[PDB]
Amino acid sequence: SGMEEWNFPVEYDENYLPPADSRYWFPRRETMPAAERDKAILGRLQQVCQYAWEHAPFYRRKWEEAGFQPSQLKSLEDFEARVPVVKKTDLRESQAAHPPFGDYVCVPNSEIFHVHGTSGRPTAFGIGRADWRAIANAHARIMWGMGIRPGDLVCVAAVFSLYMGSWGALAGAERLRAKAFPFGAGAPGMSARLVQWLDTMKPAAFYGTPSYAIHLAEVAREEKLNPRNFGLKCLFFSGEPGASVPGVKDRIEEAYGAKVYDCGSMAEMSPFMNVAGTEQSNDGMLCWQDIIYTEVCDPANMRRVPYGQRGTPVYTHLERTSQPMIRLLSGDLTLWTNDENPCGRTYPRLPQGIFGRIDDMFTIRGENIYPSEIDAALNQMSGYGGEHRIVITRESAMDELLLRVEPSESVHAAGAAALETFRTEASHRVQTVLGVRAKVELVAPNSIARTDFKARRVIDDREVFRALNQQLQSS
Amino acid sequence: SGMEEWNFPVEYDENYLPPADSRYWFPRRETMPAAERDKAILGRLQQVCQYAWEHAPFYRRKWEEAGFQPSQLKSLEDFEARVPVVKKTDLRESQAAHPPFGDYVCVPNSEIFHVHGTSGRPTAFGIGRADWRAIANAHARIMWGMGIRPGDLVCVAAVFSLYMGSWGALAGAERLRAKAFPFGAGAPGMSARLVQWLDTMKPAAFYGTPSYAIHLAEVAREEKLNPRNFGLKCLFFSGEPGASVPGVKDRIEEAYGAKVYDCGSMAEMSPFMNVAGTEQSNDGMLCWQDIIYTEVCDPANMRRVPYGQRGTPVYTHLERTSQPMIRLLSGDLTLWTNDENPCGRTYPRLPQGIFGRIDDMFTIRGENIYPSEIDAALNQMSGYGGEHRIVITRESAMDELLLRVEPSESVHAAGAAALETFRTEASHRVQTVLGVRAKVELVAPNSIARTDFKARRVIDDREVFRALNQQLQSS
Numbered sequence: 001s002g003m004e005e006w007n008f009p010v011e012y013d014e015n016y017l018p019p020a021d022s023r024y025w026f027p028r029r030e031t032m033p034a035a036e037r038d039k040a041i042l043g044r045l046q047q048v049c050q051y052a053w054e055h056a057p058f059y060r061r062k063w064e065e066a067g068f069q070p071s072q073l074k075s076l077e078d079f080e081a082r083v084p085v086v087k088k089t090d091l092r093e094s095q096a097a098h099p100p101f102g103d104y105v106c107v108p109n110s111e112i113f114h115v116h117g118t119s120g121r122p123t124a125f126g127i128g129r130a131d132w133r134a135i136a137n138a139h140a141r142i143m144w145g146m147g148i149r150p151g152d153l154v155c156v157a158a159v160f161s162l163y164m165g166s167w168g169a170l171a172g173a174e175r176l177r178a179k180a181f182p183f184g185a186g187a188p189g190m191s192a193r194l195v196q197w198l199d200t201m202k203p204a205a206f207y208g209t210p211s212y213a214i215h216l217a218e219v220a221r222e223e224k225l226n227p228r229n230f231g232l233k234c235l236f237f238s239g240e241p242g243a244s245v246p247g248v249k250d251r252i253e254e255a256y257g258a259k260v261y262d263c264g265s266m267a268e269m270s271p272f273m274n275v276a277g278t279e280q281s282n283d284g285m286l287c288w289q290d291i292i293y294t295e296v297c298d299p300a301n302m303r304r305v306p307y308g309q310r311g312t313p314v315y316t317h318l319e320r321t322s323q324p325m326i327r328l329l330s331g332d333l334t335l336w337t338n339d340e341n342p343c344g345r346t347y348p349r350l351p352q353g354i355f356g357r358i359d360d361m362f363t364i365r366g367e368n369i370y371p372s373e374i375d376a377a378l379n380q381m382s383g384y385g386g387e388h389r390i391v392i393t394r395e396s397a398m399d400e401l402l403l404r405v406e407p408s409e410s411v412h413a414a415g416a417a418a419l420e421t422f423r424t425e426a427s428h429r430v431q432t433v434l435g436v437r438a439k440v441e442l443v444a445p446n447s448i449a450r451t452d453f454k455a456r457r458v459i460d461d462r463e464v465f466r467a468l469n470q471q472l473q474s475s
Numbered sequence: 476s477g478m479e480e481w482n483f484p485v486e487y488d489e490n491y492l493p494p495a496d497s498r499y500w501f502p503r504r505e506t507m508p509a510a511e512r513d514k515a516i517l518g519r520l521q522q523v524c525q526y527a528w529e530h531a532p533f534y535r536r537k538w539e540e541a542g543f544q545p546s547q548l549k550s551l552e553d554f555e556a557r558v559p560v561v562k563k564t565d566l567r568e569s570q571a572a573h574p575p576f577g578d579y580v581c582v583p584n585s586e587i588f589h590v591h592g593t594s595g596r597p598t599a600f601g602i603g604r605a606d607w608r609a610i611a612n613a614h615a616r617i618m619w620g621m622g623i624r625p626g627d628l629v630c631v632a633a634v635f636s637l638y639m640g641s642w643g644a645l646a647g648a649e650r651l652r653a654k655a656f657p658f659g660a661g662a663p664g665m666s667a668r669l670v671q672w673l674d675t676m677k678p679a680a681f682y683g684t685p686s687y688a689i690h691l692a693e694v695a696r697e698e699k700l701n702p703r704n705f706g707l708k709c710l711f712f713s714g715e716p717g718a719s720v721p722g723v724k725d726r727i728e729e730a731y732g733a734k735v736y737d738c739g740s741m742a743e744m745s746p747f748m749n750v751a752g753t754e755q756s757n758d759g760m761l762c763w764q765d766i767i768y769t770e771v772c773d774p775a776n777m778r779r780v781p782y783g784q785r786g787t788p789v790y791t792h793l794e795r796t797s798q799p800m801i802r803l804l805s806g807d808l809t810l811w812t813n814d815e816n817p818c819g820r821t822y823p824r825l826p827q828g829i830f831g832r833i834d835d836m837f838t839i840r841g842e843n844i845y846p847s848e849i850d851a852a853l854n855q856m857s858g859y860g861g862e863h864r865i866v867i868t869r870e871s872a873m874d875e876l877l878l879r880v881e882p883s884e885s886v887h888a889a890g891a892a893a894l895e896t897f898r899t900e901a902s903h904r905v906q907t908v909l910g911v912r913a914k915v916e917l918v919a920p921n922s923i924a925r926t927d928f929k930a931r932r933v934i935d936d937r938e939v940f941r942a943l944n945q946q947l948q949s950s
């Protein structure tokens with residue numbers, strides 16, 4: 001194959017640094033014919049499944065139940081149809097019956113290097129020493145693709161706790177031999193201090209959520225600092241949609257005078273940057289197939305949908321020995337294509353990134369709406385204040401969409417008629433985009449809580465919905 | 476000398492693990508005759524000063540001004556008298572004139588691995604890749620001394636941001652081949668989730684501030700969880716006094732049913748665990764002289780005080796190439812001794828740890844009081860609620876000590892007379908301990924804000940002091 005350090009278990013050279021003139025960290029793996037890479041991926045898939053069969057009773061039980069033996073994996077079509085998908089609920093049950101890391105941990109307790117997890121039943125991540133190096137090496141490779149280089153100051157501004165996002169970006173920065181600046185997030189008073197550090201330090205790259213980048217520009221402005229004077233060449237994000245959302249990407253690129261990159265699958269899927277945009281293929285994300293095998297499937301049969309069609313990402317680790325995920329169902333919605341990429345990398349693409357989680361979708365008069373579609377339409381409006389909330393009910397069918405929208409400070413300062421003009425135009429814009437009646441209630445500028453993490457814009461409470469609709473009928 | 480990996484610049488074997496039966500990580504360095512170690516320390520001091528003279532114009536300028544050349548360093552007595560102390564204010568001025576890391580950085584920009592700093596003018600830490608390994612190796616060595624072993628689950632519960640404390644404990648846990656659990660701190664809702672993770676995971680070791688350990692036991696109790704059921708063998712702390720404070724150490728050891736260890740110098744002094752207690756020498760801290768040279772000096776002449784006398788710690792890095800500190804003044808107060816240690820390590824000891832920062836001390840009727848003396852006396856009382864505040868003024872001389880003290884919930888539930896009995900007894904106890912009049916105002920239980928970081932118990936406001944004294948005169 002000629003694939004750079006193509007081994008299982010993987011063992012990367014910690015001293016390797018690509019030539020300064022190279023666009024690719026691994027020229028072969030990243031640009032080889034897709035059909036040649038798919039031959040080696042299937043080869044690796046067989047190794048991984050044999051490994052999981054040996055060390056994970058969780059996979060041994062699940063596969064035996066669905067009538068699968070690793071020897072039946074003879075093609076990528078066999079993987080799709082014979083291998084059952086892993087659900088996040090299966091991981092919880094495995095961890096409850098086999099605490100703390102479940103019966104899919106594989107490595108002995110002795111090899112466990114880091115303990116992380118989920119929050120908001122939580123799952124524990126028991127990552128081995130070798131897997132941490134595989135994650136760091138994979139991330140340095142993908143960050144190089146974004147134009148991030150050794151010696152560049154990289155600000156990692158996501159919470160350093162159970163959350164894998166921050167740790168993953170730090171591990172990549174460390175291996176890329178960049179100046180890792182792990183400021184983190186989460187504590188009150190952090191954002192006001194961060195803008196001062198960004199003004200002083202002038203970083204080349206920034207990592208966090210797309211929501212935090214917006215909140216931080218407002219903080220920079222309140223602190224009488226200009227976010228374009230932070231010397232950023234790029235901002236790279238994961239955690240939620242935004243970085244491949246038309247109006248959101250444009251607002252962040254304009255506020256910082258830098259490029260925006262979309263990345264991120266799942267925390268269970270670390271190296272989560274396995275889906276990521278590159279400096280030239282800057283819109284959407286590429287599926288780095290030789291790091292993690294991505295399949296975009298029809299949720300009805302868990303089989304790959306054709307290119308140009310929407311489906312759910314199903315992921316398989318190719319370079320992990322601790323808690324390896326084999327066909328984990330994301331529960332997210334995307335669209336994938338297989339056209340020539342501007343960077344020259346021969347990978348499938350998610351041109352619009354990831355739309356959101358299927359469970360977050362709601363319905364108004366037979367029309368399926370994703371919260372990111374509302375966020376996208378509102379962010380493309382000049383008078384929009386940067387924040388909103390969607391008030392819904394899943395206990396009864398909704399006839400109209402209730403929105404609490406913030407106007408801009410200049411729209412508010414322009415008076416009562418100017419506010420009413422924006423409220424009417426916002427309602428109409430959402431209606432033209434979604435094809436459903438939209439009731440808009442204007443709230444005071446900067447009243448809606450901002451976040452340094454993931455934006456939770458849907459209020460699914462029944463009482464709140466009734467209270468709002470009744471108040472919107474009285475006005 | 477026979478000293479294990481005694482080299483400058485240092486380059487530790489990343490694969491070395493002490494025998495399972497060994498008490499010491501480095502038996503020679505840790506237990507060799509003190510006079511033999513002092514010969515090699517002086518040797519290293521000469522190497523470090525020669526290195527700083529070559530690569531740091533900050534040290535070149537400062538030393539030339541005070542009439543010092545590295546060749547004049549011929550004994551430990553020469554170091555004391557000829558080498559001028561570095562003040563934290565000198566670091567700020569060096570960083571302002573030579574941004575971002577000052578003229579004492581030494582390493583080229585290319586070698587910088589991590590960016591951290593101070594908060595509450597801030598100083599930036601530019602730590603090189605090699606120094607990070609030196610810090611991690613030094614910390615794994617000191618943590619081994621506390622009885623922490625490979626495979627042990629180590630909870631790091633301090634904010635992972637600019638603060639070096641969390642990063643230092645994590646780096647040590649990683650190198651000790653322990654199961655690093657970097658939960659961190661700082662965000663609302665973290666403590667409630669942490670107690671659940673500690674109940675589930677059952678860690679062998681916990682790192683944070685002594686204040687956070689107290690706050691967390693109250694959170695565990697509110698969450699109907701018993702902190703003794705967290706399976707902790709030890710808790711090791713840095714950041715402020717507490718772990719060598721009589722009543723505070725006893726309260727934490729009782730609440731968790733585990734041992735408490737004191738460690739920590741300064742963030743500028745990473746590896747900051749250079750002052751740390753050991754499993755057998757569990758009271759106070761030992762000065763790990765071959766990691767960082769500690770001198771306890773008279774603040775009047777910056778020369779070493781005899782053993783058994785109080786003074787200020789002055790520190791010198793022996794294993795750092797990036798931002799190396801040579802005779803940095805801590806501004807703290809301690810007492811050092813040179814008697815045989817129960818663990819067998821031949822190091823000077825701080826038997827009562829560090830009392831506090833000299834600038835934090837206040838005076839009432841010609842009597843010098845440290846906030847930790849009030850905290851120590853109150854924590855030794857059965858009716859004390861776990862929190863208090865000291866209300867002072869530095870604009871005018873104080874005749875009495877104003878205290879806002881919290882009673883226990885059981886003292887409150889016992890009625891008005893029981894509350895008045897505690898208030899009178901608290902006032903008398905502080906008076907007997909300090910030798911000054913103490914006015915006590917009781918506040919409602921759990922009203923005073925708790926912290927996951929450093930407790931700021933002194934309220935130095937003039938208006939607040941006058942308001943309180945006037946109210947305590949009316950009652």
Ligand SMILES: CC(C)(O)C(=O)OP(=O)(O)OC[C@H]1O[C@@H](n2cnc3c(N)ncnc32)[C@H](O)[C@@H]1O
Nearest residue numbers: 165238239240241263264265266267272354357
């Ligand atoms: C990828 C990471 C570590 O940043 C993360 O947030 O992982 P986590 O397991 O906490 O949550 C994963 C979910 O966040 C969402 N998400 C993460 N990155 C993106 C993204 N780039 N675009 C659209 N949604 C994303 C998806 O719904 C995904 O299933």
Ligand SMILES: CC(C)(O)C(=O)OP(=O)(O)OC[C@H]1O[C@@H](n2cnc3c(N)ncnc32)[C@H](O)[C@@H]1O
Nearest residue numbers: 640713714715716738739740741742747829832
């Ligand atoms: C040592 C570290 C990284 O945890 C820390 O807090 O360093 P930082 O530079 O932020 O602050 C250092 C100051 O905290 C106090 N401190 C740190 N550890 C202790 C301690 N163990 N005992 C009595 N005071 C301590 C001293 O006043 C010291 O000068």
